[PDB]
């Protein structure tokens, strides 16, 4: 049993978001929130928001057991891009799956 | 307790109860064949050979299945010469269950 949260069309680069995500994958949620909230990357706020939404959905629709939450899968993938004249803006999708076990 | 014999022109060292691959032969599946051609017999004391075609060795071979070998693709190509051909190929093979060694 796991809860999936995917934020689409993120307004940030697909690399820096990946750099932020690399530091949180495989870490306990309790300390993951604290460590992520105290970083120097603007992309960190999007990750915090999506993780907060994921945990809120998990606790509302399923047993909270907030202490025993562990992140299993998390990844960022490049999203839609539009061509214009000054260039393409880079968008990303952020996906996080959290399971108690 | 093994033996050495050639049937399709290829030397084979086969022990009792060991399945070996031989070239295709016009041998029916329902009948056994005799390979009177022997070259060496392995036992507690090996039987030396002074001349080939030793009559003291009798080998019974029973074909159990038929088929072709693994498909192999041969490609002949030349650089800058616009010459290139490709063709698949396979070879028939037979398996014989060897029982009993004559000393």
């Amino acid at each position: 049993m796991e809860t999936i949260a995917k934020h689409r069309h993120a307004r940030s680069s697909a690399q820096k978001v990946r750099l932020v995500a690399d530091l949180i994958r495989g870490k306990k949620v309790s300390q993951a929130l604290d460590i992520l909230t105290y970083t120097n990357k603007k992309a960190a706020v999007l990750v915090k928001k999506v993780l907060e939404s994921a945990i809120a959905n998990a606790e509302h629709n399923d047993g909270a057991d907030i202490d025993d939450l562990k992140v299993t899968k998390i990844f960022v993938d490049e999203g839609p891009s539009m061509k214009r004249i000054m260039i393409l803006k880079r968008t990303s999708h952020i996906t996080v799956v959290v399971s108690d076990r | 307790m093994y033996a050495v014999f050639q049937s399709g022109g290829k030397q084979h060292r086969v022990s009792e109860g060991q399945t070996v691959r031989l070239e295709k032969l016009d041998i029916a599946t329902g009948e056994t064949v005799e390979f009177a051609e022997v070259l060496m017999i392995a036992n507690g004391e090996e039987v030396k050979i002074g001349v080939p075609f030793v009559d003291g060795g009798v080998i019974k071979a029973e074909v159990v299945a038929h088929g072709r070998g693994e498909k192999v693709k041969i490609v002949k190509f030349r650089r800058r010469k616009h010459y290139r051909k490709q063709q698949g190929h396979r070879q028939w093979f037979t398996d014989v269950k060897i029982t009993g060694i004559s000393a």
Binding site: - | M40, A42, E46, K48, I49, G50, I74, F77
Partner: protein, 117 residues
């Protein structure tokens, strides 16, 4: 009546890429270089199959020379004795008997020495 080439090109690319697996990135993903990779691999396989007989012949020669030296006889003299004694055992059989059972090879070389002169 216009016809669409999508199906034929799709099938050709699929079949050619299927044989091209594990060629260090681009060669296994890009058709342009994948064609060269597969054709060169086929030619290399053909030539290596041709040379495999020679390679295994060299391996058997080395093993037989090692066995003869261990038994205390030169490889050339051993071959001369074996052939002049009316023995048609293939080098593969000699290597197999030498590696597996040492007593049999020792007896064979002793017999060759007996029928050497």
């Amino acid at each position: 009546a216009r016809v669409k080439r999508g199906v034929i090109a799709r099938a050709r690319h699929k079949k050619i890429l299927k044989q091209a697996k594990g060629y260090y990135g681009a060669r296994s993903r890009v058709y342009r270089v994948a064609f060269q990779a597969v054709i060169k691999a086929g030619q290399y396989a053909y030539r290596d199959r041709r040379q495999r007989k020679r390679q295994f012949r060299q391996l058997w020669i080395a093993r037989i020379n090692a066995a003869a030296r261990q038994n205390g006889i030169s490889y050339s003299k051993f071959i001369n004795g074996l052939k002049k004694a009316s023995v048609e055992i293939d080098r593969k059989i000699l290597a197999d008997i030498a590696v597996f059972d040492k007593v049999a090879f020792t007896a064979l070389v002793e017999k060759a020495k007996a029928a050497l002169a």
